[PDB]
Design an enzyme around this catalytic site. Structure first.
Site, PDB file in Angstrom:
ATOM      1  N   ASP A  32       0.812  -1.212   0.000  1.00  0.00           N
ATOM      2  CA  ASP A  32       0.000   0.000   0.000  1.00  0.00           C
ATOM      3  C   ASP A  32       0.851   1.270   0.000  1.00  0.00           C
ATOM      4  O   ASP A  32       1.384   1.666   1.039  1.00  0.00           O
ATOM      5  CB  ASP A  32      -0.909  -0.002   1.229  1.00  0.00           C
ATOM      6  CG  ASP A  32      -1.831   1.195   1.268  1.00  0.00           C
ATOM      7  OD1 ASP A  32      -2.026   1.835   0.211  1.00  0.00           O
ATOM      8  OD2 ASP A  32      -2.356   1.496   2.359  1.00  0.00           O
ATOM      9  N   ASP A 216      -1.493   5.602  -5.393  1.00  0.00           N
ATOM     10  CA  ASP A 216      -1.947   4.763  -4.279  1.00  0.00           C
ATOM     11  C   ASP A 216      -2.285   3.340  -4.710  1.00  0.00           C
ATOM     12  O   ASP A 216      -3.381   3.071  -5.207  1.00  0.00           O
ATOM     13  CB  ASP A 216      -3.177   5.403  -3.639  1.00  0.00           C
ATOM     14  CG  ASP A 216      -3.641   4.674  -2.401  1.00  0.00           C
ATOM     15  OD1 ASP A 216      -3.034   3.642  -2.036  1.00  0.00           O
ATOM     16  OD2 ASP A 216      -4.624   5.145  -1.788  1.00  0.00           O
TER      17      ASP A 216
HETATM   18  C1  LIG Z   1      -8.255  -2.938  -2.194  1.00  0.00           C
HETATM   19  C2  LIG Z   1      -9.574  -2.693  -1.452  1.00  0.00           C
HETATM   20  N1  LIG Z   1     -10.353  -1.637  -2.115  1.00  0.00           N
HETATM   21  C3  LIG Z   1     -10.334  -0.300  -1.753  1.00  0.00           C
HETATM   22  C4  LIG Z   1      -9.457   0.198  -0.750  1.00  0.00           C
HETATM   23  C5  LIG Z   1      -9.467   1.575  -0.409  1.00  0.00           C
HETATM   24  C6  LIG Z   1      -8.587   2.122   0.623  1.00  0.00           C
HETATM   25  O1  LIG Z   1      -8.997   2.848   1.531  1.00  0.00           O
HETATM   26  N2  LIG Z   1      -7.277   1.779   0.521  1.00  0.00           N
HETATM   27  C7  LIG Z   1      -6.345   1.886   1.639  1.00  0.00           C
HETATM   28  C8  LIG Z   1      -5.663   0.504   1.847  1.00  0.00           C
HETATM   29  C9  LIG Z   1      -6.642  -0.624   2.093  1.00  0.00           C
HETATM   30  C10 LIG Z   1      -7.767  -0.500   2.957  1.00  0.00           C
HETATM   31  C11 LIG Z   1      -8.655  -1.591   3.134  1.00  0.00           C
HETATM   32  C12 LIG Z   1      -8.421  -2.811   2.452  1.00  0.00           C
HETATM   33  C13 LIG Z   1      -7.305  -2.940   1.596  1.00  0.00           C
HETATM   34  C14 LIG Z   1      -6.423  -1.851   1.420  1.00  0.00           C
HETATM   35  C15 LIG Z   1      -5.377   3.042   1.322  1.00  0.00           C
HETATM   36  O2  LIG Z   1      -4.436   3.159   2.367  1.00  0.00           O
HETATM   37  C16 LIG Z   1      -6.025   4.406   1.105  1.00  0.00           C
HETATM   38  N3  LIG Z   1      -4.974   5.405   0.849  1.00  0.00           N
HETATM   39  C17 LIG Z   1      -5.267   6.842   1.103  1.00  0.00           C
HETATM   40  C18 LIG Z   1      -6.246   7.388   0.032  1.00  0.00           C
HETATM   41  C19 LIG Z   1      -6.701   8.821   0.370  1.00  0.00           C
HETATM   42  C20 LIG Z   1      -7.499   8.841   1.697  1.00  0.00           C
HETATM   43  C21 LIG Z   1      -6.862   8.015   2.811  1.00  0.00           C
HETATM   44  C22 LIG Z   1      -7.325   8.184   4.142  1.00  0.00           C
HETATM   45  C23 LIG Z   1      -6.770   7.441   5.211  1.00  0.00           C
HETATM   46  C24 LIG Z   1      -5.737   6.515   4.970  1.00  0.00           C
HETATM   47  C25 LIG Z   1      -5.261   6.332   3.645  1.00  0.00           C
HETATM   48  C26 LIG Z   1      -5.808   7.068   2.548  1.00  0.00           C
HETATM   49  C27 LIG Z   1     -10.350   2.458  -1.067  1.00  0.00           C
HETATM   50  C28 LIG Z   1     -11.236   1.996  -2.067  1.00  0.00           C
HETATM   51  N4  LIG Z   1     -12.085   2.923  -2.667  1.00  0.00           N
HETATM   52  C29 LIG Z   1     -13.286   3.241  -1.818  1.00  0.00           C
HETATM   53  C30 LIG Z   1     -14.473   2.269  -2.006  1.00  0.00           C
HETATM   54  C31 LIG Z   1     -14.999   2.244  -3.453  1.00  0.00           C
HETATM   55  C32 LIG Z   1     -13.926   1.758  -4.433  1.00  0.00           C
HETATM   56  S1  LIG Z   1     -12.489   2.802  -4.265  1.00  0.00           S
HETATM   57  O3  LIG Z   1     -12.829   4.120  -4.698  1.00  0.00           O
HETATM   58  O4  LIG Z   1     -11.418   2.164  -4.982  1.00  0.00           O
HETATM   59  C33 LIG Z   1     -11.225   0.603  -2.408  1.00  0.00           C
END
Ligand SMILES: CCNc1cc(C(=O)N[C@@H](Cc2ccccc2)[C@H](O)CN[C@H]2CCCc3ccccc32)cc(N2CCCCS2(=O)=O)c1
Ligand SMILES: CCNc1cc(C(=O)N[C@@H](Cc2ccccc2)[C@H](O)CN[C@H]2CCCc3ccccc32)cc(N2CCCCS2(=O)=O)c1
Length: 373
Positions: A32, A216
């Site tokens: 990640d 990301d």
């Molecule tokens: C792979 C699983 N799918 C999705 C995962 C995430 C998501 O939040 N990813 C995490 C890691 C993580 C979290 C949970 C499980 C696995 C990995 C990342 O770490 C965010 N980084 C940063 C991004 C900016 C904001 C933020 C805030 C706090 C921490 C990190 C972050 C958003 C998604 N989406 C939302 C739901 C709809 C589809 S999407 O649009 O793809 C879809």
């Protein structure tokens, strides 16, 4: 021996094998670049096939401090500690690193994903509880002689490669183009222009980076600010107007399906994201095909058809260039030189008419800074 060390399922992230503890406990860990905590399941959970057992590790040290981490999707809480960590198909080294032992979680672990933890590869500035919790990659660099750089080749069950400490030329073709890391917290970059179907969206470029733009691997979609999202959907609708889809599709609430083998790729436009270059008012573009932003959803029940989810969605926390964007590109996180490189990957997306591309240079006469802040 690092090539093809990533696995995954579509929409569920890419993971690499790691070991924690001594004797080593093997776990699959989601890679990640959008967070900065290293955390592993450390108690039973319905979706965990296995988990970190601290009592079995002679080298585990408890830091006697709890931690809570919320993401866009999911959240967890756990206990901070340190232990020995290795990457069997990465650099052959062992480091003592911070590890959050996840003991409670909500909508974080995914049923059938095959991973049990997450490796936050971004900077200390966004680590929880605070920036004094050194991220894994920082520990790796400090304790070993590994160069301060890694690269990701995510390919569209899925696979890919994480190369630590260097660039593997066998994984890309053409030139590497670099965009500056604007601030070392997330991997923040600047988008200066967006075209869809070759047509400029014609917004003040600050709109594209409200309030930040990041690269990301842990987010699935291309996520866009509301104003940009709305304009993008209108443009994609117009280009694909020979077919009409329900509103729910564009919102990610419905799949679109076609009889197997008949997906009309050609009626969907290519999207070009122009990224700030290393020189004033220069940029390069990465061009994305519909095979990237229409994400396949595997389901045997629907399998007389091919069905897809629209993988562009709206955000109020800035632009996120997620996994579907990174797919088919070789992406270099050159931390040492504070820049991100893009090149066409050896698993790049293409059919017989079009191809993903990384191209430049481009020049703009407008002297505006596109950073929002
Ligand atoms: C792979 C699983 N799918 C999705 C995962 C995430 C998501 O939040 N990813 C995490 C890691 C993580 C979290 C949970 C499980 C696995 C990995 C990342 O770490 C965010 N980084 C940063 C991004 C900016 C904001 C933020 C805030 C706090 C921490 C990190 C972050 C958003 C998604 N989406 C939302 C739901 C709809 C589809 S999407 O649009 O793809 C879809
Ligand atoms: C022989 C086909 N060749 C290519 C076609 C396109 C492409 O999407 N063309 C747009 C207009 C457009 C879009 C972007 C920039 C300028 C014009 C048009 O809207 C076609 N719609 C469809 C019209 C019906 C027939 C059709 C057939 C095949 C594809 C699309 C269409 C892009 C190509 N490259 C551009 C540069 C980046 C790599 S690429 O994307 O490979 C190569």
């Amino acid at each position: 021996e690092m090539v093809d060390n990533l696995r995954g399922k579509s929409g569920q992230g890419y993971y690499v094998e790691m070991t924690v503890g001594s004797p080593p406990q093997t776990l699959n860990i989601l890679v990640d670049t959008g967070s900065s905590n290293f955390a592993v399941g450390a108690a039973p959970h319905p979706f965990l096939h296995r988990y970190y057992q601290r009592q079995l590790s002679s080298t585990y040290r408890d830091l006697r401090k709890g931690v809570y981490v919320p993401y866009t999707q999911g959240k967890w809480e756990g206990e901070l500690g340190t232990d020995l960590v290795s990457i069997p198909h990465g650099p052959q080294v062992t480091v003592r690193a911070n590890i959050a032992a996840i003991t409670e979680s909500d909508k974080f672990f995914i049923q059938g994903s095959n991973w049990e933890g997450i490796l936050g590869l971004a900077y200390a500035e966004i680590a929880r509880p605070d920036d004094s919790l050194e991220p894994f990659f920082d520990s790796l660099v400090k304790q070993t002689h590994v160069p301060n750089l890694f690269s990701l080749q995510l390919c569209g069950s899925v696979g890919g490669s994480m190369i630590i400490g260097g660039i593997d030329h066998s994984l890309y073709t053409g030139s590497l183009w670099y965009t500056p890391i604007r601030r070392e917290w997330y991997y923040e970059v600047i988008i200066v222009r967006v075209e869809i179907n070759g047509q400029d969206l014609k917004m003040d470029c600050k709109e594209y980076n409200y309030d930040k733009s990041i690269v990301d691997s842990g987010t699935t979609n291309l996520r866009l600010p509301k104003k940009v999202f709305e304009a993008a959907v209108k443009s994609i609708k117009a280009a694909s107007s020979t077919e009409k889809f329900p509103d729910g599709f564009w919102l990610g609430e419905q799949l679109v399906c076609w009889q197997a083998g008949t997906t009309p790729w050609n009626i969907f436009p290519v999207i070009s994201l122009y990224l700030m270059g290393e020189v004033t008012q220069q940029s390069f573009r990465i061009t994305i095909l519909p095979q990237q932003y229409l994400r396949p959803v595997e389901d045997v029940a629907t399998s007389q058809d091919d069905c897809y989810k629209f993988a562009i969605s709206q955000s109020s926390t800035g632009t996120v260039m997620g996994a579907v964007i990174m797919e088919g590109f070789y992406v270099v996180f050159d931390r040492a030189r504070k820049r991100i490189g893009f090149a066409v990957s050896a698993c790049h997306v293409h059919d017989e008419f079009r191809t993903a591309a990384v191209e430049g240079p481009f020049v703009t006469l407008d002297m505006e800074d596109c950073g929002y802040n």
